[PDB]
Amino acid sequence: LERFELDKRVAQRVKEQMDTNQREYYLREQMKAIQKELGGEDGLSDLEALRKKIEEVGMPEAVKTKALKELDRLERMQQGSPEATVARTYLDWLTEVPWSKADPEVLDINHTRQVLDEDHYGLKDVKERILEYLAVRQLTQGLDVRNKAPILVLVGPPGVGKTSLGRSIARSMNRKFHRISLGGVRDEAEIRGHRRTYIGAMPGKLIHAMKQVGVINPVILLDEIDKMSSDWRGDPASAMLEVLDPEQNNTFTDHYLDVPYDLSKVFFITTANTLQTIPRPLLDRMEVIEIPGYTNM
Amino acid sequence: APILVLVGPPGVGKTSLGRSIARSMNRKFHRISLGGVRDEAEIRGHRRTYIGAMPGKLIHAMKQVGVINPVILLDEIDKMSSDWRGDPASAMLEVLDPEQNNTFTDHYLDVPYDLSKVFFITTANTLQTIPRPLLDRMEVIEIPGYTNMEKQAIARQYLWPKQVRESGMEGRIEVTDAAILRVISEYTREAGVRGLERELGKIARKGAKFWLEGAWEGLRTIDASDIPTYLGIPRYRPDKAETEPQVG
Amino acid sequence: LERFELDKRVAQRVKEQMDTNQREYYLREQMKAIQKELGGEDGLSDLEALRKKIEEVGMPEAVKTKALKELDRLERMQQGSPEATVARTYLDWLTEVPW
Amino acid sequence: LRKKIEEVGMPEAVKTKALKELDRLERMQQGSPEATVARTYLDWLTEVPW
Amino acid sequence: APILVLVGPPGVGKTSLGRSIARSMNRKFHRISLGGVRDEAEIRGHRRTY
Amino acid sequence: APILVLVGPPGVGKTSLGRSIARSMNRKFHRISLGGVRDEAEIRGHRRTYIGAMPGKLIHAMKQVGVINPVILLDEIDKMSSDWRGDPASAMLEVLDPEQ
Amino acid sequence: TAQGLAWTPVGGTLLTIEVAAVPGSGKLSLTGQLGEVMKESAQAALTYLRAHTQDYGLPEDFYNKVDLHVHVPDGATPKDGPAAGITMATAIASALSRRPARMDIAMTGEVSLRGKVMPIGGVKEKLLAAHQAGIHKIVLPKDNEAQLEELPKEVLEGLEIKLVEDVGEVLEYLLLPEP
Ligand SMILES: Nc1ncnc2c1ncn2[C@@H]1O[C@H](COP(=O)(O)OP(=O)(O)O)[C@@H](O)[C@H]1O
Ligand SMILES: Nc1ncnc2c1ncn2[C@@H]1O[C@H](COP(=O)(O)OP(=O)(O)O)[C@@H](O)[C@H]1O
């Protein structure tokens, strides 16, 4: 009878455990019944509104053809059909990156001098190698904005207002500042994503911030790139050094970018703040600027 | 037929030498550094069982070049290690010699790949740490640093034109023998040419900053006088002839 | 009233969610059902070949007993399971060392 | 991938290797590493010079 | 009875003697180096379970 | 006040009477020779210089017993050598005095 | 106690301990987790017992014969410089001096056999580590005269730079009494 009451006890444990699992299952499907609430609106924006944005975006005939190509295949019953996911996931940043707009290029390094004079006081070491960076950024191997070179990654303590740094340079360059999550995240979905045959593979946060503005040349702050690593083995070294190479960046594919995106005039910045946590193949296309911090006064 | 080893400090042009030989052979060229390798698990593959299971560095190296016959440069085979179980020294042994690698495979792969035709180099830096059965059947070549004359030759003839050509300084900034004399004999002190690239870059992009703030002179001479203007201070002596005549 | 109707439209939406989940999952066991009919079958021919190699290599009886008991462990998935690819390596080590 | 293996010259044993692992594709395409990692394998095989 | 150890300088013929005996006895010569080994597992057998 | 040094014939009388008293006081007897012990790093702990720094043998005497107040017999107290850092005797004087 | 300041790669600190005085034989020992260049520098520092017994005013018996109990606070002692191993030598140099250090008055520099302070690297980072802690009195080698003005004009407003020329002059700028 002790065995029998043990059976009753373990039967109660298994019943509460299955009730728990069932309750969590209902909880998730509510989330899916609470999230799917705006699903129809997404399809509407991914429908005629999407096409209108494509028109204003005026994507290159090749890219527009692609959009139209997938879109004509996606032309059908919008409901009970995934055509909306492939019609938005890949065509949302394509409709959010108009090619009739772009950030005003400041060829005047002297202008940068002035706007960085009021970051805190100029800092006398940041702005000098930044101003190297701009004067070269105009004057390159092709005498244009092409790297074949470093983009000047930082090194220092994180304590400064580095957001305001990106904003004051995006002012001194008339750039549309963004921020993302790239460092600390350990999955290739904010950084690369993977080919659009599964969710969880995603536009990278660079693609998301690229969607955040229409200008074809924003500034995607590769946020705390010093802590970069990813649980997905198979390095984003291909991604990072392929986007760092403009010859590979105008052809920038990824695992996710199954079409070479025309990331040509796109500007990035690199940000390190720790001198050991580095995966090796970022030894190139990187160089370091002195960034002075704050004393107690 | 023994494989070349090019032991010596970094930055002495070992892999650019391989670039030259590739040009001389009209093949492609590639490197894969084995510096800081501690297992067979990545030289041969990890056995494919999950996302996050990878083939070997040689497989990658094969994948970047699009030719079956490149000239691989096995950089830093001396920094090859095994501090955890798994001694992959023998893995490189079966890679190098020509007969046995004819049907090479990694643990990630199953394909016996052909590697008899692929010319190899193998760069190390010191042979005193290579496993001794590895050390058989190669050629041990120390490659030195370069004399001050030789180093200014590297800069003036081969590096400084690259510095001025990456940063749009082409034909607008002239830099004299006195300046690069100051660069080596006054400022830069290292085995390879590696840091020279960096402080030369500091000079270079400071000069580009100077040219784009107004091209009052189309020819901006950076001689040994304004070297501390473009770069920082001379942090070592110009000549070792100037310290003191010491007693003992 | 609008909170009531919002809850009703949430209830319909979670009803659709569970409908979708049972349908797609039913598809998952249909693909598995159609799979083991042939899809898993052809990969077994590898195991049959390895076993035939073990059977044909003349071995002592202790060798063969250890081989068969390790082999019965191998009668499971290894292709995403790092706990039975080591079994495949084990059995292939046994059949390819002379006896 | 079938087309790519078809065009990239394969040893016939390696050709059948790829065909078999292709049959280890066509079964799933999403979630666990079950054909995804097999897709990585096939992509590796295709993009090696032959 | 003993098992024929060989001692001597690094470059002097040892493996030559081994292969000479091997051909002489009609044997496949082989070599396994044991430099730097400090684990019993790496030469006897490592734990099979993982 | 004394702690009853035992001196006289070697290997004769001393430990016997000590074990006798520990039987009388019903205190867990122990016995530690210090003839080969000539380093204070053996009286108190060894200063950490590698993996395997180690305590004094007096803690080890406390390590073989489950109380903090038995009767313990020490052995060979009448010689001394400063062959190592300092002397082992000073740490033993630290052991004797109650506030030390 | 001596302000053997060493800049950590992460943040900035003023490396120092509280010191005993327990002399006797040349085995001051620490599991400092030192680097290999600092390992060989320590192996040099072995015979630097015979070298620092003559370079400063320290007595002759320092050639081989001093202990003490030293506990360097940062067990992760490697701070990207040769300011790890000379710290024990400086601490003993203050210890055999038997007279203490100067309150909120640090020191830094590089020590040599001939008796001169070579300028210490990172004048900005050493002066951030000095000022962010709260010390306002600074002992820098004389060749940092041109590198005092290379720093921004907000670090050194509460800072007094007492320039030093010898390692003995460090001792008057660090040891508590007048000599
Ligand atoms: N006296 C010798 N006779 C024949 N072969 C030799 C002699 N000395 C060196 N060798 C060559 O040296 C190589 C190294 O092997 P071996 O000399 O037998 O032992 P070890 O590897 O210890 O030097 C052999 O391949 C052999 O061809
Ligand atoms: N009066 C006594 N009666 C019985 N046994 C004695 C007497 N005196 C000495 N002994 C013997 O002397 C020994 C004690 O000496 P031992 O324990 O060997 O070393 P130590 O005397 O140096 O501590 C005991 O074994 C004991 O048998």
Author numbering:
A (entry chain E): 200 to 496
B (entry chain D): 348 to 595
C (entry chain C): 200 to 298
D (entry chain D): 249 to 298
E (entry chain C): 348 to 397
F (entry chain A): 348 to 447
G (entry chain E): 596 to 774
Which sentences from the paper describe this structure?
The Lon protease is a AAA+ protein found in prokaryotes, archaea, and eukaryotic organelles. Lon is involved in cellular protein homeostasis by degrading damaged or misfolded abnormal proteins, which prevents these unwanted protein species from forming toxic aggregates. Lon is known to form a homohexamer; each protomer is composed of multiple domains, including an N-terminal substrate-binding globular domain (NGD), a long-helix domain (LH), a three-helix bundle (3H), a AAA+ ATPase module, and a protease domain. We show here, using cryo-electron microscopy (cryo-EM), that the activation process of the Lon AAA+ protease may involve a pentameric assembly and a substrate-dependent incorporation of the sixth protomer to form the substrate-pore-loop contacts seen in the translocating state.
To test this hypothesis, we performed single-particle cryo-EM reconstruction of the proteolytically deficient mutant MtaLon-S678A incubated with ADP and the model substrate α-casein. The pentameric assembly forms a left-handed open-spiral structure. The open-spiral pentamer forms a large gap between the protomers Ob1 and Ob5. The pentamer forms a tensegrity helix triangle (THT), consisting of three overlapping LHs from Ob1, Ob3, and Ob5, forming an interlocked, letter A-shaped structure that tethers together five protomers. In the pentameric assembly, only the pore-loop residues, Tyr397 and Trp431, of the protomers Ob1, Ac4, and Ob5 are accessible to the entry gate lined by Tyr224 and Met217 residues. Notably, they are scattered along a right-handed spiral trajectory.
